[PDB]
Design a protein around this ligand. Sequence first.
Ligand SMILES: [Mn+2]
Ligand SMILES: [Mn+2]
Ligand SMILES: [Mn+2]
Ligand SMILES: [Mn+2]
Lengths: 304, 307
Amino acid sequence: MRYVVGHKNPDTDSIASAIVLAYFLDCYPARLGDINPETEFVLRKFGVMEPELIESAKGKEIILVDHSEKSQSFDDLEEGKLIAIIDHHKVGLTTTEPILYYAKPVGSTATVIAELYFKDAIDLIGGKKKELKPDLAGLLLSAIISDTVLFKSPTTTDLDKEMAKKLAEIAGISNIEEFGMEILKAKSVVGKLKPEEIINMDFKNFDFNGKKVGIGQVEVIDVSEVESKKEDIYKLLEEKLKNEGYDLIVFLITDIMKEGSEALVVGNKEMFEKAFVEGNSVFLEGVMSRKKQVVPPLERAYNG
Amino acid sequence: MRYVVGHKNPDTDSIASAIVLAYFLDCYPARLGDINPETEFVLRKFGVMEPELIESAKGKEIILVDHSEKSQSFDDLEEGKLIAIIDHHKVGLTTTEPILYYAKPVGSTATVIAELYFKDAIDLIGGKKKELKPDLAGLLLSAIISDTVLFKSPTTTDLDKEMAKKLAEIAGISNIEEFGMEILKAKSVVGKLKPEEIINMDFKNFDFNGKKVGIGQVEVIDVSEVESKKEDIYKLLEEKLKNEGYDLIVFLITDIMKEGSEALVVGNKEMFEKAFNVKVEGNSVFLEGVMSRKKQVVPPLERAYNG
Ligand SMILES: [Mn+2]
Ligand SMILES: [Mn+2]
Ligand SMILES: [Mn+2]
Ligand SMILES: [Mn+2]
């Protein structure tokens, strides 16, 4: 009756935070979509099973992790009962009743959970005060690394590193740098998938001043792979744009090594141009984080 | 600079939480409105000075306590630098960037702060591990009692009681029940005030799916005097409705002993009747067991509006 769920097109933070929190809250973990390769890698590595799929909150109690935007959560959230939101994004969700809300401007939701655990404050968000086994500690570690892109992303903070170090200990990972590289590789395999799989792997929806806007992403070590599919990708996006009523779609081809992204712009390029473009896209040096470096200047332009 | 501020038409929770958190965060305490009789009583009691009054957030770093609603905060909140929100109400504010946000559905903001304090985790929200002196412990205590209406309100949780007992110990308050009776008599004096004062003393404004709704409230031990002003109060609420463009206004005459509220309904009566599965006879209705605005009135009403 009570579930912990991350956002649609869940990433590692959403799956790991849901699983670990469900453990401390003594309820059910779940996912609002399929898990990507990087997550499949981690769950398999630490021996944790994939959470059950959930698509409707109707008649259920829900704890949301890693997001606060209706567009990224249940469509029928109102028909269920929101219990809590543990996140690290800007406040985007409004509620009708008091809920347990805990957000911090850090690198991942796992970082937030972990800090509460080591600080002996898990009970502050309903946690039962149980031990954090190495398998779960491995999930949280992977979430931090996944979310911060091995501490290279500008959303990375001191708390993120400090927590990674501690979790790495309980998890038994001696070389975070190397384990992290393994994670960055699993993240990269997305490039070998079909264009449709690539776009729907990590796409997020936003509502900037009434205009539906989507921002997808791909994070690879070597962009060569995705670039050969770029044309087909950009094509499927133009279709998605018109067929699903988007006013704009930004697709980030993030090069992990150059720490910058090629931003494919679909739809209202004017707004994009006003927010930050020769033809297909443009490269944005140093841009890696959607939430930190792309959503803000974009929302600022739609309601300004 | 950095300020910790409560909401417009401040109650004791808003004042105490602003002062105490400011003390822990080492910044300036402040208020968005005038202090009510109950708070004046509580402040004088623990020898604590009244927080400075401010009105504009422009150029200020803000930390909001006890509220998450634009229409209850600075008119220019946006022009300020929102640092954090420590509350116990529903989420009503969206932010432009990640922020420290900590809200628990307990009886008061004071409860949240105290729980962080005793767990030695005040640093989780920026605290500086300072010691809670008896005077400030007394304010938190007063805030809890005030917000829960002496643990009578359904927002009251075990945490609220647990925290109250520990705070009473520090503040040197041997009998919480007796002190609470005083606080309850303090809320009641509002009933003695003129209609206009009773209306503005604890009026909250909201945005429900684009609609401007107002929910005021008065809590008394003997409602008879407020009832003798009910008529005049209603007229004023009718004027407030059309002049300030409210889609709906509800004023709760809360009977502390019967633990219920007589709701005065102005404007969109239909939406109200829908919200509470009850048709209104006249311009008001008594809601049995209803004492909490945030837990019993806002939820069904905002759900009706956007639903
Ligand atoms: Mn995520
Ligand atoms: Mn995350
Ligand atoms: Mn208040
Ligand atoms: Mn309060």
